[PDB]
Amino acid sequence: PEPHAVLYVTNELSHIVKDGFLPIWKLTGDESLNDLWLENGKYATDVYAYGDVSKWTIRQLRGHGFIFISTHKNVQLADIIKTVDVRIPREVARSHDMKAFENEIGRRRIRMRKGFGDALRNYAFKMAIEFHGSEAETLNDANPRLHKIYGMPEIPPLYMEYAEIGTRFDDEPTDEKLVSMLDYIVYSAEEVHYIGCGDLRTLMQFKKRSPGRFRRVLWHVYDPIAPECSDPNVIVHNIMVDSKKDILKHMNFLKRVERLFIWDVSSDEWETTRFAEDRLGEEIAYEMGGAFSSALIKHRIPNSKDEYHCISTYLFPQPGADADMYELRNFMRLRGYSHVDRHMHPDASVTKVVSRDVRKMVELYHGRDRGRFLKKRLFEHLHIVRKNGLLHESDEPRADLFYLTNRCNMGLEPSIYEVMKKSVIATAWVGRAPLYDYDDFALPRSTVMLNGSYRDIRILDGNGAILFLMWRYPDIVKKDLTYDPAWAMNFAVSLKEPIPDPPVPDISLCRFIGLRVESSVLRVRNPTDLSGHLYVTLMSGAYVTDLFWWFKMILDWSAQNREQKLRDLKRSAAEVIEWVRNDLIAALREYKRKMGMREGASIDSWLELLRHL
Numbered sequence: 001p002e003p004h005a006v007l008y009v010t011n012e013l014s015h016i017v018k019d020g021f022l023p024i025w026k027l028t029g030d031e032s033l034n035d036l037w038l039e040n041g042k043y044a045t046d047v048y049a050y051g052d053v054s055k056w057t058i059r060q061l062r063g064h065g066f067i068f069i070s071t072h073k074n075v076q077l078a079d080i081i082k083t084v085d086v087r088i089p090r091e092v093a094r095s096h097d098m099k100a101f102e103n104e105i106g107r108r109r110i111r112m113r114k115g116f117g118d119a120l121r122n123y124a125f126k127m128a129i130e131f132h133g134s135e136a137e138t139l140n141d142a143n144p145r146l147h148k149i150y151g152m153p154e155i156p157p158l159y160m161e162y163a164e165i166g167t168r169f170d171d172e173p174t175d176e177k178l179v180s181m182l183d184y185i186v187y188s189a190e191e192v193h194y195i196g197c198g199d200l201r202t203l204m205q206f207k208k209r210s211p212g213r214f215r216r217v218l219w220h221v222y223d224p225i226a227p228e229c230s231d232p233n234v235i236v237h238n239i240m241v242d243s244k245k246d247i248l249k250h251m252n253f254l255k256r257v258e259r260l261f262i263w264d265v266s267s268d269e270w271e272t273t274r275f276a277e278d279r280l281g282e283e284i285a286y287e288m289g290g291a292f293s294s295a296l297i298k299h300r301i302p303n304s305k306d307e308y309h310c311i312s313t314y315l316f317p318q319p320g321a322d323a324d325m326y327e328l329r330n331f332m333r334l335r336g337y338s339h340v341d342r343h344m345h346p347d348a349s350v351t352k353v354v355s356r357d358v359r360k361m362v363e364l365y366h367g368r369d370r371g372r373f374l375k376k377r378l379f380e381h382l383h384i385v386r387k388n389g390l391l392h393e394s395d396e397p398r399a400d401l402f403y404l405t406n407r408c409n410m411g412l413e414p415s416i417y418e419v420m421k422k423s424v425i426a427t428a429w430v431g432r433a434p435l436y437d438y439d440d441f442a443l444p445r446s447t448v449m450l451n452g453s454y455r456d457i458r459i460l461d462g463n464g465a466i467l468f469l470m471w472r473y474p475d476i477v478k479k480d481l482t483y484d485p486a487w488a489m490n491f492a493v494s495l496k497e498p499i500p501d502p503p504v505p506d507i508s509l510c511r512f513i514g515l516r517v518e519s520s521v522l523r524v525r526n527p528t529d530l531s532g533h534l535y536v537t538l539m540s541g542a543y544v545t546d547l548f549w550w551f552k553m554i555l556d557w558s559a560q561n562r563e564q565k566l567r568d569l570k571r572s573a574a575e576v577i578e579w580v581r582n583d584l585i586a587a588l589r590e591y592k593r594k595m596g597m598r599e600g601a602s603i604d605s606w607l608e609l610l611r612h613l
């Protein structure tokens with residue numbers, strides 16, 4: 001809505017910038033500190049800035065809006081030596097297009113989005129069990145035997161009871177049929193009984209592409225033709241499979257396991273055989289359903305047959321499969337032990353299927369340049385538990401990432417806050433820019449600040465949030481991380497997290513960039529200095545900081561002391577950019593003088609903690 005990034009370019013580059021239409025901030029060794037703060041506070045859009053900054057720490061430079069652009073890998077700082085966020089290929093200096101330069105920034109910037117979420121996401125696994133509004137991306141880093149991952153993901157094209165299909169969606173090529181198969185089924189299995197595993201090149205490329213969940217799985221791969229393979233989590237079976245009893249003899253029942261069953265079996269002039277194998281794969285699983293959480297049965301669709309039968313939970317198309325391939329995969333959710341509570345997915349049963357409706361499935365969805373997004377949906381629908389963050393009641397600590405503020409959730413803001421009252425970590429779109437690739441809606445910052453801040457709940461904009469996590473847990477959030485402060489600052493972020501002792505006014509807390517310009521506007525647009533300060537911070541809706549801590553610091557802390565307040569900074573590894581009970585309550589009062597109604601309790605809640613300090 002206001003917040004910018006300082007687009008810090010290194011020297012060898014400076015001259016192009018000059019030709020832009022964005023402003024250019026110029027340094028110069030001295031400045032002082034409160035020089036930067038008053039300067040930077042001058043820009044309302046992103047800016048380009050260069051010149052010596054050797055003097056300053058990183059957190060200082062992030063608190064400030066800095067993104068690092070050079071042709072060199074990294075730049076010197078006071079703190080340490082930072083990996084350049086945006087490296088230009090020199091050819092693309094150099095050259096000297098102001099634009100293809102600019103476009104170059106944009107993209108890697110957009111790429112940076114994922115470092116931010118990752119930083120947060122990555123705190124959350126360190127602190128959380130439940131996980132709401134989730135997707136492939138979280139599945140990706142979960143330990144399924146710990147985390148429990150929730151959400152309502154968009155549902156892939158499905159056969160069962162049960163039609164609706166399609167409608168069609170746009171897509172993109174992926175890994176080949178059979179690798180892409182593996183890809184979406186392996187999440188939380190532990191033991192895979194892959195039958196008709198072939199020559200293994202499949203599984204082998206999977207291992208070449210997904211080494212973690214390959215190794216955190218024990219494979220029995222059943223097949224006469226299957227080659228010897230060392231891999232000591234890979235047990236090779238040269239048996240052929242007619243009976244379930246060729247799987248029993250390869251199972252530890254004296255110990256608990258999510259077991260997965262995969263049936264990819266076909267032989268060598270009708271193929272009402274092709275059929276019985278499919279059926280027999282199923283028939284085998286069924287009997288065993290009680291050992292396996294699930295099955296993925298191969299399921300060629302007949303020609304000769306018009307409607308027919310099988311045991312299934314689901315039937316669906318499969319990514320990257322040639323468009324003439326009329327072979328759906330069949331899913332079977334089963335009873336039998338598992339880490340993901342798939343109960344939602346109906347206990348795999350006898351399903352009457354209409355070849356034509358299936359045909360139309362393949363026709364719509366197959367194509368060896370069409371899979372990506374299907375595969376995802378398959379992957380999420382299968383492994384995430386279909387639960388709704390807002391409505392869910394949580395015995396265990398919970399994370400609530402980037403889903404609260406979705407446009408489905410409009411009107412349910414109450415429930416939103418109540419969630420950010422009890423979340424380990426969650427976040428909300430505050431950004432008032434006009435505003436693309438992202439489909440959320442914004443909580444008024446003022447409201448966020450006031451509803452959000454509790455003894456136990458810290459309430460910072462994305463950047464602050466980031467900053468904080470560095471400071472406090474430097475190895476969940478490396479200092480040298482790369483991200484976009486400005487993007488970080490479209491977020492409100494909230495953490496089950498005590499105020500520091502001492503309430504040292506660190507940068508994660510105090511940045512208040514542009515508060516000067518922000519105050520003038522206030523007075524020239526909708527009219528009416530520590531009181532003045534806090535009124536503006538709110539009346540503006542340009543900032544999200546944690547009031548409570550801010551309070552506890554302002555009073556219980558400053559003054560305090562020229563000496564014994566730095567000292568307790570030192571000490572608290574903290575840093576800054578800017579070097580009485582009543583004015584605040586007047587602040588408060590005045591504020592809601594302008595807005596009973598559109599707020600605020602609470603307000604009250606706050607006030608009534610000043611003159612009840």
Ligand SMILES: C[n+]1cn([C@H]2O[C@@H](COP(=O)(O)OP(=O)(O)O)[C@@H](O)[C@H]2O)c2nc(N)[nH]c(=O)c21
Nearest residue numbers: 271274300301302303304324325326327355359
């Ligand atoms: C109309 N139709 C075409 N095909 C495909 O089947 C091929 C014939 O050879 P195939 O051995 O039946 O392939 P399959 O193992 O996938 O079933 C080509 O005709 C492909 O287009 C079909 N394949 C199946 N399985 N079922 C169908 O109804 C069908």
Ligand SMILES: Nc1nc2[nH]cnc2c(=O)[nH]1
Nearest residue numbers: 113114116117118137402
């Ligand atoms: N910052 C950010 N990170 C993400 N990681 C995955 N999705 C997102 C997102 O929308 N924003």
Ligand SMILES: Nc1nc2[nH]cnc2c(=O)[nH]1
Nearest residue numbers: 136140183184375376379
């Ligand atoms: N199967 C699968 N699909 C994905 N789509 C995006 N990420 C993944 C992943 O890890 N596995």
